[PDB]
Design a protein around this ligand. Structure first.
Ligand SMILES: O=C(CCC(O)(O)[C@H](Cc1ccccc1)NC(=O)c1ccccc1)N[C@@H](Cc1c[nH]c2ccccc12)C(=O)O
Ligand SMILES: *[C@@H]1O[C@H](CO[C@@H]2O[C@@H](C)[C@@H](O)[C@@H](O)[C@@H]2O)[C@@H](O[C@@H]2O[C@H](CO)[C@@H](O)[C@H](O)[C@H]2NC(C)=O)[C@H](O)[C@H]1NC(C)=O
Ligand SMILES: CC(=O)N[C@@H]1[C@@H](O)[C@H](O)[C@@H](CO)O[C@H]1O
Ligand SMILES: *[C@@H]1O[C@H](CO)[C@@H](O)[C@H](O)[C@H]1NC(C)=O
Ligand SMILES: [Cl-]
Ligand SMILES: [Cl-]
Ligand SMILES: [Zn+2]
Length: 582
């Protein structure tokens, strides 16, 4: 028994490394060059890896885990027992694989065109409009158009997708796809734990929400903003109203208090490569790993100009040979994208840190950890002090302080309910309580309930707004981002302390702290070998997820906001919850 298990795992590892590397290669070619050939080859490689998954999974299911002594081996085998999609019968598997490809391509090539005029793509055109336009009608055009072309077009595929991924889950011992995803955290209390964290940041979010609403009231008019109702979803500077820092100019606490970081980056010669190089340098400044020469040669750090159609949504790639790691991002030169570059570089650092673990264990402590690493560093990079060291800025006062806290919050705090929202909707879709006839109505009910947002124009049958959010048609879980946004503050808190920082947490910049680096590396090296609370404890000193670090970070802003909102007699929340615009 124990001997057969040790041998199975060794064989699984050497062969998975080969089969996974080959699949990644085909996946990469499709993602960076969407064509019928690359698509067809990716579909073919899907069956190859499925063959391998079916072969080893079947054998894994014959062993008896729990009657096995070694803990590492027991964990590896338990995992291999999950055939994920490879559990579906050949016909269903093929169909499923094709549906996923069709949704991904439909989303990545969608465009919104002006009658016999120009056609805009999501990146960089539509996203630039949402970020810079201050005209209600122009934002509406881009917001509605994107949902009309991308979301409406994903609808025809989704019910089948749901049917098939649920079927795969059931064949793997789960009750539905949501239950399967949820299990990646190995935490029985997960749903209640997350609900408690959400409720924790509620006071902070309702205050930020009220304050932003008043500012939008000021700029867009009383006729378009209800001071007691939800905010029209196209006005927050981001296509999904998931992060709001692009409307900072409309909400600046102390207008008399910074420069244009974009203009600085552009005139100072910043380019996508320089942006990734700066992230690389930040990691090595912490004693962490530099990316290999190969990374610079094979990555796609900007949208190609040779005519190639690509998947622009940012992603980091492990080719499972512990040498080849790459990023695929249609990077634009600006602070927001620099944060995203740092984020992707954290995924790469994780790949490099656990590259020596069996491939079954080359994963984050939990999916949230993988998402967090990168953001922890970007918090330091975002401080006024660090940005001035980068010459991107020409502060120091309390007003400057509140302004920085506001900027950060517009992103970090606003994202909490959005990130919470996405899988609440999908878990309900997967478990069957939300049928296709109600997909969109339920999405908006959640949009209203959690974010306090409303659609600027009524939605009609055939609308499928979730379809216009990458992760939905891409079938990428989303709760990981909610977890990340919470715990990255816990890690920042711990790293700042390990770096000897004193005073307000938001004034911390861990740049060049070897101690901070070592804190992370030790936990990053564990991959998925130990239960996540253990990685959590190594980094922070305790085993739980906690919203305290985040609250602590934003404490000064929470106090300022309460005072500011009370002075204007703001009514927190959206009492008049049925309100919709013009
Ligand atoms: O989706 C992303 C970044 C893309 C990703 O790096 O998370 C990427 C998504 C993906 C997963 C699977 C297939 C294709 C794309 N995930 C990875 O690159 C990745 C790699 C290895 C392990 C885990 C994830 N961010 C989210 C959350 C987000 C919004 N704004 C942000 C600002 C800073 C940090 C995160 C966000 C979003 O844009 O809605
Ligand atoms: C449980 O097994 C792990 C893993 O052992 C390795 O993988 C097996 C499939 C087989 O190929 C073995 O020959 C390998 O040694 C043991 O942990 C490893 O320990 C060695 C030596 O300390 C170390 O180099 C590796 O990093 C360890 N790997 C991991 C994942 O921790 C572990 O010692 C065994 N536990 C017990 C109680 O015996
Ligand atoms: C650089 C290297 O060889 N890393 C290997 C890794 O690929 C393999 O999965 C592991 C087996 O547990 O043994 C490590 O030494
Ligand atoms: C894109 O893919 C097509 C089809 O496989 C191929 O002919 C072409 O060479 C690729 N383009 C690049 C830049 O590699
Ligand atoms: Cl939406
Ligand atoms: Cl997840
Ligand atoms: Zn990510």
């Amino acid at each position: 028994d124990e001997a057969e298990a040790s041998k199975f795992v060794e064989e699984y590892d050497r062969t998975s490394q080969v089969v996974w590397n080959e699949y990644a290669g085909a996946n990469w070619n499709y993602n960076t060059n969407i064509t019928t050939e690359t698509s067809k080859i990716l579909l073919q490689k899907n069956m190859q890896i499925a063959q391998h998954t079916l072969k080893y999974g079947t054998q894994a299911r014959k062993f008896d885990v729990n009657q096995l002594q070694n803990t590492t081996i027991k964990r590896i085998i338990k995992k291999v027992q999950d055939l994920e999609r490879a559990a579906l019968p050949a016909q269903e598997l093929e169909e499923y694989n094709k549906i996923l490809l069709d949704m991904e391509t439909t989303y990545s090539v969608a465009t919104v065109c002006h009658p016999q005029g120009s056609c805009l793509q999501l990146e960089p055109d539509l996203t630039n409009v949402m970020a810079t336009s201050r005209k209600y009608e122009d934002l509406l055009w881009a917001w509605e158009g994107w949902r009309d072309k991308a979301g409406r077009a994903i609808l025809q595929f989704y019910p089948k997708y749901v049917e098939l991924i649920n079927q795969a889950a059931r064949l793997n011992g789960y009750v539905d796809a949501g239950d399967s995803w949820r299990s990646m955290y190995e935490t029985p209390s997960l749903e209640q734990d997350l609900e408690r964290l959400f409720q924790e940041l509620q006071p902070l979010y309702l205050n930020l929400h009220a304050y932003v609403r008043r500012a939008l009231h000021r700029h867009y008019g009383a006729q378009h903003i209800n001071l007691e109702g939800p905010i029209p979803a196209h006005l927050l500077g981001n296509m999904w109203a998931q992060t709001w820092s692009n409307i900072y100019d409309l909400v600046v606490p102390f207008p008399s208090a910074s420069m244009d970081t974009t203009e600085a980056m552009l005139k100072q010669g910043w380019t996508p490569r320089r942006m990734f190089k700066e992230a690389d340098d930040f990691f090595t400044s912490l004693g962490l790993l530099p990316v290999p020469p190969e990374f610079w040669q094979k990555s796609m750090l900007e949208k190609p100009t040779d005519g190639r159609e690509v998947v622009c949504h940012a992603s980091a790639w492990d080719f499972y040979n512990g040498k080849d790691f790459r990023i695929k991002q249609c990077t634009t030169v600006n602070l927001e994208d620099l944060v995203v570059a740092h984020h992707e570089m954290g995924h790469i650092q994780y790949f490099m840190q656990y590259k020596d673990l069996p491939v079954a264990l080359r994963e984050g402590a939990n999916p949230g950890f993988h998402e967090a690493i990168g953001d922890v560093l970007a918090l330091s990079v975002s401080t006024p002090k660090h940005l001035h060291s980068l010459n991107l800025l020409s502060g120091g006062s309390d007003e400057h302080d509140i302004n920085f806290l506001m900027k950060m919050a517009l992103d970090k705090i606003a994202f909490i309910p959005f990130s919470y929202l996405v899988d609440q909707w999908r878990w309900r879709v997967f478990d069957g309580s939300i049928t296709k006839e109600n997909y969109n109505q339920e999405w908006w009910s959640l949009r209203l309930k959690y974010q306090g947002l409303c659609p600027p124009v009524p939605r009609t049958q055939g609308d499928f707004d979730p379809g216009a959010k990458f992760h939905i048609p891409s079938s990428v879980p989303y709760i990981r981002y909610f977890v990340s946004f919470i715990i990255q503050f816990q890690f920042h808190e711990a790293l700042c302390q390990a770096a000897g920082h004193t005073g307000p947490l938001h004034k911390c910049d861990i740049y060049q702290s070897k101690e901070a680096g070592q804190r992370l590396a030790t936990a990053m090296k564990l991959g998925f070998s130990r239960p996540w609370p253990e990685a959590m404890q190594l980094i922070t000193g305790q085993p739980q997820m906690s919203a305290s670090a985040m609250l602590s970070y934003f404490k000064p802003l929470l106090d300022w906001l309460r005072t500011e909102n009370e002075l204007h007699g703001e009514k927190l929340g959206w009492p008049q919850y049925n309100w919709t615009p013009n």
